[PDB]
Design a protein around this ligand. Structure first.
Ligand SMILES: CC(=O)NC[C@H]1CN(c2ccc(N3CCOCC3)c(F)c2)C(=O)O1
Lengths: 46, 151, 150, 150, 346, 50, 50
């Protein structure tokens, strides 16, 4: 995602936003899957 | 001019004087009925929907002072498409939430276990809103399809 | 004025006096037989549009005294462009019937002046025209009294 | 913006300048005490004077080069062409004429006049023809300036 | 690879916005009345044959997107909401289709309808925007001829193309020759003559006046009935030095000429715009490159340049190429083998 | 003696200036001041040195 | 800026009349280029010598 995020021409914010949105979502999903999701997978699961 | 016999030459006498249009080049007809309106051109790097909402704002405080008959009409508008875009996208988001809840249920028998992924991704979604805002972005047609696709 | 006239009495004077402006893609000009020239300068994407407006609007200033006084007392404008509108607030009449020449005026004398100023509106296009003291000379009545338009 | 704060305070002093200066070149630029590129233009085959070369560079190159890639201030070595009229004091006096008569004759006989159009802006109904009118057009050749009536 | 190559390329899908528009172009020197007639026809096509879709029209006479004048006309069309338009035939595409098909039939002028290319008109691909520049000191007529030559050679061997000009029709004009000699003889000032003509036929901005608080303009022109035909030139008389009126036709001289109502210029030079679309078979760059060698067959002094449009994607090769590097490098940061970064790659 | 910016004229498409001055040979020396005459109200020429 | 000067000036050469030829006195480019060259060269020499 991040390499193709390197936009260009009039297709700038196009591929840009369409990438970095999902990249941000990715890093956040990962942190959540390393903080929130594990803790909830603990606590109460079974 | 005042002629030799003392007769005056008024402008009225040499020219038809009427309170007329400054320009007779263009004429607008709304549904065959004579009319005139405001064709607002956007500014480069403007806020779009904010600008339109504020157009409605400034135009709102004129309606009470209008003369008899003077009525507003709205042809060529962009707002409902934006609103319905947001609507039809968020709707898809929710549909994906429920449809992932059902798959999470028709695989994990436990009702308490199928809550975790249902709780996880709304958090992840909101964080993205915080990031895009902190990066200078906004709710866009690409930054919503991006959300739905990233789900 | 005609196209040939405006193309080299307003257009070229502006164009030749339009140089030394940061980040400029191109400069395309239309000279209309209605007596209306519209010069467009395109700037590299992501540029500071606010200052880009300035560098042009102020180099125009160095060409204004070289324009005909007919044009100087007429409307000269420097704006941010958007090739299409968004809102088109049409105004009509129902009860107290007023002409399409009345409506245009009223919109241009209670609405347009404010709407063009509100929330960074780029360039309001008015469909019609504001009122004006219109005097229609009669050639015969002028000559019969021995009088010229002057 | 530093360019702006100056260029725009100049604007508040322009009407206090002589009209000779106002119709002359007034400029506000970014300064660099030295050049970098000095593109000299010469001739080999079809020999043209240094007064021809200067003009051609100032009529095909300078206008564009000064606009390209944020060029600060192009200094031209020579000058663009111009209709040059060298008055003869004796021939003026022998015919009883002053420079003022020459200037007036030029400003009156060499200009472009704005005339309206057949089938004007507000027409009579059933009008089938709309065409623009052309009055006096600006002179072109040297010979045309030769035949100015004094 | 085969399913990838034979996949046509696009930028962003054009879609129903519930609001579209249609333009009308009358021939040379047409009048407000005629274009008003055509506008009536269009408007009421939208009013009688498409009631289940159209909510309101907003026709405008005298204003097009090409420019101003009595030749152009515009029509903003707002359709009923998406719900009340169930079928695909009620979507913007089909509506504009049948509309254009009807207009192409029952009109003696040029009328088109067009779905709003979502966002600003910038970028379409599979088409171009060509610009023919007059580099030397050639006249407008020579440039026009060169333009005709380009537009002829392009359509001569269209692996095709579809090329047209931008709207420079070049219409006949009415040249008036004011003989300075006769004027100086009869005793009429050239100034007076000129301002009488200009004020009478084109009007003039005189002064300002206050109307209900708001300052508005004061224009003097003339009654329409005294300026519709060339013969009306004679109706106007001018005061001379001896205080006697003078027929205009005395010092005057008239003849019909040929000129353009729209003078275009590209970058400080006289230019004419060619709008054309690429081949139905070939692509954009192929058409452009196979148009430049056509433009390089024009007389000396005529050059070319591309503007807006012609100025997937070109970045995609390099962008995926970087995506070909960061991937392998990220397949090592947690996975050390020089075998793993060859596993997922397939 | 210093010329003057009069009007503009079209040359091969490009608008250029129109300057009126005088032949050089009638403005190189101070004594050349006398060569120039001015029309008076009575329609008679007047020596500059007057 | 200079490279783009060469750029804008490049599309004028084909339309020049007979004799009209370009020449380049007082240029800065070769000094910049030779600066980069003679510096990078030193870098490489340092690499080998180390
Ligand atoms: C209307 C307007 O002009 N808004 C300006 C934006 C730009 N911006 C911002 C934030 C982080 C970054 N960074 C953070 C560190 O480097 C990567 C991006 C950035 F470049 C820019 C911000 O806060 O407001």
């Amino acid at each position: 995602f991040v390499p193709m995020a390197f936009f260009g021409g009039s297709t700038g914010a196009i591929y840009r936003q369409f990438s970095i949105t999902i990249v941000s979502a990715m890093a956040l999903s990962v942190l959540v899957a390393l903080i929130l999701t594990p803790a909830l997978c603990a606590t109460m699961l079974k | 001019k005042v002629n030799q016999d003392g007769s005056r030459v008024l402008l009225r006498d040499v020219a038809k004087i009427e309170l007329g249009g400054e320009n007779y080049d263009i004429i607008a007809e709304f549904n065959g009925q004579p009319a005139s309106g405001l064709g607002i051109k956007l500014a480069t790097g403007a806020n779009a929907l904010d600008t339109a909402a504020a157009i409605r704002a400034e135009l709102a405080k004129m309606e009470p002072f209008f003369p008899s008959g003077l009525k507003i009409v709205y042809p060529y508008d962009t707002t409902p498409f934006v609103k319905i875009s947001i609507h039809e996208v968020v709707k898809t988001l929710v549909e994906a939430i429920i449809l992932v809840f059902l798959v999470m249920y028709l695989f994990l028998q436990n009702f308490r276990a199928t809550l975790i992924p249902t709780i996880a991704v709304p958090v992840v979604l909101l964080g993205t809103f915080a990031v895009l805002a902190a990066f200078g972005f906004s709710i866009n047609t690409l930054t919503m399809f991006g959300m739905v696709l990233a789900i | 004025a005609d196209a040939k006239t405006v193309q080299d009495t307003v257009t070229q004077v502006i164009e030749q006096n339009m140089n030394g402006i940061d980040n400029l893609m191109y400069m395309s000009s239309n000279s209309d037989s209605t007596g209306t020239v519209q010069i467009t300068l395109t700037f590299e994407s992501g540029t500071d549009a606010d200052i880009a407006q300035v560098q042009v609007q102020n180099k125009l200033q160095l060409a204004m005294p070289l324009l005909p006084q007919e044009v100087q007392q007429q409307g000269v404008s420097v704006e941010k462009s958007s090739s299409s509108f968004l809102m088109v607030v049409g105004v009509i009449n129902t009860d107290g019937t007023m002409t399409q020449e009345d409506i245009s005026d009223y919109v241009a004398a209670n609405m347009k002046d404010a709407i063009s100023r509100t929330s960074g509106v780029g360039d309001v296009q008015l469909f019609g025209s504001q009122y004006a003291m219109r005097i229609w000379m009669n050639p015969n009545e002028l000559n019969k009294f021995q009088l010229t338009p002057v | 913006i530093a360019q702006v704060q100056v260029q725009n305070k100049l604007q508040l002093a322009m009407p206090l300048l002589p009209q000779e200066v106002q119709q002359q070149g007034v400029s506000v630029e970014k300064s660099s005490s030295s050049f970098l590129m000095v593109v000299g233009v010469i001739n080999t085959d079809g020999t043209m004077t240094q007064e021809d070369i200067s003009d051609y560079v100032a009529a095909n190159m300078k206008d564009a080069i000064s606009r390209t890639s944020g060029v600060g201030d192009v200094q031209l070595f020579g000058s663009q062409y111009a209709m040059r009229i060298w008055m003869n004091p004796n021939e003026l006096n022998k015919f009883q004429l002053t420079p003022v008569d020459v200037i007036t004759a030029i400003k009156a006989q060499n200009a472009q006049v704005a005339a309206g159009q057949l089938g004007g802006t507000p027409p009579v109904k059933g009008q089938q023809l709309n065409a623009s009118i052309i009055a006096q057009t600006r002179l072109t050749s040297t010979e045309e300036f030769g035949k100015i009536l004094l | 690879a085969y399913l990838f190559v034979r996949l046509p390329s696009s930028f962003l899908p054009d879609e129903d916005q519930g609001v579209f528009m249609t333009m009308v172009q009358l021939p040379a020197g047409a009048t407000q009345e005629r274009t008003q007639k055509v506008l009536n026809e269009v408007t009421h096509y939208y009013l009688t044959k498409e009631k289940n879709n159209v909510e309101s029209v907003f026709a405008v006479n005298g204003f097009g997107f090409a420019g101003r004048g009595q030749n152009t006309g515009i029509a903003f069309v707002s359709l009923k909401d998406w719900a009340d338009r169930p079928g695909e035939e009620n979507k913007v595409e089909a509506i504009t289709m049948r509309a254009t098909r009807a207009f192409s039939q029952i009109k003696d002028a040029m009328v088109f309808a067009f779905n709003l290319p979502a966002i600003v008109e910038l970028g379409t691909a599979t088409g171009f925007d060509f610009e023919l520049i007059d580099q030397a000191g050639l006249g407008h007529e020579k440039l026009t001829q060169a333009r005709n030559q380009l537009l002829a050679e392009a359509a001569k061997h269209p692996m095709l193309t579809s090329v047209r000009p931008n709207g420079l029709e070049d219409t006949p004009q009415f040249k008036i020759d004011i003989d300075q000699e006769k004027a100086q003889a009869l005793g009429v000032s050239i100034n007076d003559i000129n301002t009488t003509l200009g004020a009478a036929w084109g009007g003039s901005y005189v002064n300002d006046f206050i109307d209900r608080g708001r300052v508005k303009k004061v224009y003097v022109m003339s009654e329409a009935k005294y300026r519709m035909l060339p013969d009306d030139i004679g109706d106007w008389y001018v005061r001379a030095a001896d205080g006697q009126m003078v027929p205009f036709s005395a010092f005057s001289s008239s003849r019909w000429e040929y000129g353009s109502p729209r003078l275009e210029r590209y970058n400080g030079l006289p230019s004419m715009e060619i709008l054309g679309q690429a081949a139905p078979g070939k692509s954009t760059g192929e058409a452009m490159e196979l148009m430049e060698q056509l433009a390089s067959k024009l007389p000396t002094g005529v050059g070319y340049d591309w503007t807006g449009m012609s100025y997937s994607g070109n970045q995609a090769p390099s962008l995926y190429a970087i995506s070909l590097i960061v991937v392998f490098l990220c397949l090592a940061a947690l996975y050390e083998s020089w075998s793993i970064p060859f596993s997922v790659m397939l």
